[PDB]
Design a protein around this ligand. Structure first.
Ligand SMILES: Nc1ncnc2c1ncn2[C@@H]1O[C@H](COP(=O)(O)OP(=O)(O)O)[C@@H](O)[C@H]1O
Ligand SMILES: Nc1ncnc2c1ncn2[C@@H]1O[C@H](COP(=O)(O)OP(=O)(O)O)[C@@H](O)[C@H]1O
Lengths: 398, 392, 169
DNA sequence: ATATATATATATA
DNA sequence: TATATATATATAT
């Protein structure tokens, strides 16, 4: 296994944010909202890496839409790019306002991996997203999502996020524990990964080959459900603990359908499925529907990224069974209601700010995506090419 | 290599855009905004060749939308033709107001090429386009686009702009470093480029030779990726450095410099639907795969349509040029937000960068047929190129 | 023939005609005479494009995309400003449009791509939309009676026999 | 009290 | 079916 020292290590941050600067910014926000119609008093300050949440208590008898309908003007009168108004804070009467700082600290990916969450995270598919608005990291199990949608316009830090997720997979799991399928219609980003032992296929370029790979994944899901029926288990981890119990007693439990092995966790990533549904058509959308409908228990998981949030790409069928959404900076509030099904995705800053939406109804966790460099990615790729051979299958492309 | 003096020389340096005249304009703007409900205060003044930016400082309480929803009346009462309100200036607390200036000045192309951004440039295929709001030039780079759709109607800026791009190819590079392929089912516009040493074929008249040229380009893409998989090379300039090190050593190479290829089409609208939609898969495979090979596309059409500019061509080309399609309604076919709303026909354009954001305000620098024909004859003094019959 | 002669428009080829026997120096046939400017008037292309189909629209689009520097022009007249007649094919290629009194703003957006055509006072009072600037220029129509038409037809029939290319049909 | 902004309702590409 | 336009309604003036 690769160590945690291949990365560029933890840097020294420019933490010069004094309490007198916080008091000055608090009084400045009080004045600049008093100059408009509202009147508000700053309650407390949460300083952070990239943004700085202010908990402001409104006056007696002033609404919150009269704060949300001038977020642009409050951002203009403070010499910042854009402010974000959190309309509800769980457990308090205060309204949140998050102002970007000046010395925007780059989130160090080695600081994200150095957490007590990620270090003893037992699951074979973790995701180190990055630090949230208050400094601590957010590590999310990819098994429990079970799938993922990523969006945001170009240059808003999206391939960096997908590379952070794939390196989050690579620093924990062997090719006997996890396994990947990659699709790339734009060979700049994902072609750096061709050679790692966690692959089943060459990095898929054409869309007919990608349709063949997704039909192979349907067939693999169906035969895994039939094999779990033939062994009488319920989920994938139950089958892996069943064959582990066969390993513990030294007892060979043979093939129920003709010796079994620990089936690794397939993860199917897609760089741009908008091009896929635009080239091939509605049957690819129904194929992703038939994947997302059932493959939670079989251990086949989806990472979907797109650059075109619309009704044509992010449809009802894709939003049917993929409830976990990553949204970077997008253009309109209509696109925010397209992916996150609510406003608020447009207020971000670029450079990998995402609104993590967990599975289930909740306020979106604003997580700053950790920057990963081409040198670190290339070093992980070369370490796995020096510690692993490819495991290809011819049938996945035909 | 022709000098920059074969262009027409720099025109009359128009003075009398004085600080007292712009101060009178700024006080006029303060008075005309004070007559309505708002109160404004001009902070600084950014002049320019075509238009002028006024960084105004709004007072306490006045919103931006109050300024934006009377812009028609403000542009009426300033004796100007239009106005635009830049709602955000990064890092400053000031709203930008864009006012068209008095003399709609033409951008001189020698004023574009004389800047050190073009002269000390490092790549081989730049596209000098024009200036900003303040007159500082914007010299882009075609190697990072990596493909460039041009579309528009009504004879707006298109053929002059494509000539400016191809001259930006001409003035820097040699044919050994950057070749060209030209395709035009119109026999008219780009026929003046016949005989220049940067080409590879005649200016294509029979569209079956255009399909065979694109077929040769696809096979060239295939053999260049076979070359790079035989050499372990990501993008073309790495192999150019490797063959430079093999040329310093005289080292021959195996059979699995390479010329940079830029293919233009001016009327693929009727061509792609009459010759066959099999052309579109060729164009999409080139624009997908050959973005690291060196085969770049300056695609141009006279009819920007949903039929001929589909999503299949929108996929691999995120760097777009649109002058006048009809309006901001059918704009989303090529420029995804909005098009000919304040593009003044012959001139200003919207350059969509390889990233995104507010796209670049680019004034289309003028080129004339004397300059075009003179650069063509100056390169025809350097020689006639190689012509491949398999392309034809 | 203009690609053979290296000519950049029609007016350049009439300048080649001025280089020909107009200035007293005859040419060859690669003696090329004048190529006359053709103004093809169509009184009702709605009937044509609803009866015979869309291949006529393919022909009209291949003309209207290209024929400025050619020597063939079209005055298209109709009575249905609708998508059933005027599609987007014959929209972006004819940027100069005459709009008389129509009965809806929808038809005004169908032809002029804006509003204000149904407001006209009738009887030839049109909205000349010039090329380039997409702003309407309102023009009152000039009345010419049928007797003046018979006079001009008589004045041309008393001067020249019909010079036909009869094989057009 | 009433011009403005806006959410929705019907007609069309 | 997505959208451009049109009409009735809070809203703060
Ligand atoms: N966490 C981060 N810190 C700093 N910069 C970032 C971060 N994430 C992304 N970026 C910047 O954003 C850019 C990534 O854009 P990207 O989303 O890959 O474009 P596209 O959507 O076209 O693939 C990079 O150039 C990088 O500089
Ligand atoms: N910088 C400029 N200044 C003034 N006019 C320009 C400039 N650039 C282009 N033009 C005008 O553009 C016209 C040519 O349009 P063109 O590019 O041929 O459109 P199309 O190719 O659609 O016919 C010329 O009349 C020329 O005057």
């Amino acid at each position: 296994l690769p160590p945690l020292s291949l990365l560029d290590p933890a840097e020294v941050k420019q933490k010069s944010y004094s309490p007198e600067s916080l008091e000055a910014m608090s009084r400045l926000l009080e004045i600049k909202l008093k100059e408009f119609g509202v009147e508000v008093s700053v309650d407390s300050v949460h300083p952070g890496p990239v943004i700085t949440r202010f908990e402001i208590q409104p006056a007696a008898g002033v609404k919150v839409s009269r704060i949300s309908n001038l977020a642009k003007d409050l951002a203009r009168s403070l010499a910042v790019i854009s402010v974000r108004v959190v309309e509800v804070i769980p457990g308090k009467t205060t309204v949140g306002i998050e102002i970007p700082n000046e010395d925007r600290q780059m989130v160090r990916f080695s600081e994200v991996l150095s957490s007590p969450e990620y270090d003893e995270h037992k699951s074979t598919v973790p995701l180190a997203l990055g630090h949230d608005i208050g400094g601590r990291p957010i590590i999310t199990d990819l098994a429990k999502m079970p799938h993922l949608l990523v969006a945001g316009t170009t240059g808003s830090g999206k391939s960096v996020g997908v590379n952070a997720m794939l390196l989050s997979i690579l620093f924990k799991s062997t090719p006997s524990e996890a396994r990947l399928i990659m699709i790339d219609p734009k060979m700049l980003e994902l072609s750096i990964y061709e050679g790692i032992p966690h692959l089943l296929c060459p990095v898929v370029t054409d869309m007919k080959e990608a349709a063949n790979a997704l039909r192979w994944s349907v067939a693999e899901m169906e035969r895994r459900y039939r094999l779990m029926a033939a062994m009488g288990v319920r989920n994938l981890a139950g089958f892996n603990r069943k064959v582990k119990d066969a390993e513990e007693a030294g007892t060979p439990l043979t093939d129920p359908l003709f010796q079994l092995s620990t089936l690794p966790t397939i993860v199917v990533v897609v760089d741009e499925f908008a091009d896929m549904m635009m080239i091939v058509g509605k049957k690819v959308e129904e194929l992703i529907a038939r994947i997302a409908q059932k493959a939670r228990a079989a251990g086949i998981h989806l990472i979907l990224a797109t650059q075109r949030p619309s009704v044509d790409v992010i449809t009802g069928l894709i939003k049917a069974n993929i409830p976990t959404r990553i949204a970077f900076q997008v253009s309109s509030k209509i696109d925010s209601r397209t992916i996150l099904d609510q406003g608020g995705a447009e207020q971000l800053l670029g450079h990998g700010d995402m609104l993590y939406l967990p599975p289930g109804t909740g306020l979106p966790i604003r997580v700053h995506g950790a920057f990963v460099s081409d040198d670190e990615v290339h070093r992980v790729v070369e370490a796995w090419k020096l510690r692993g051979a490819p495991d290809y299958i011819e049938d996945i492309l035909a």
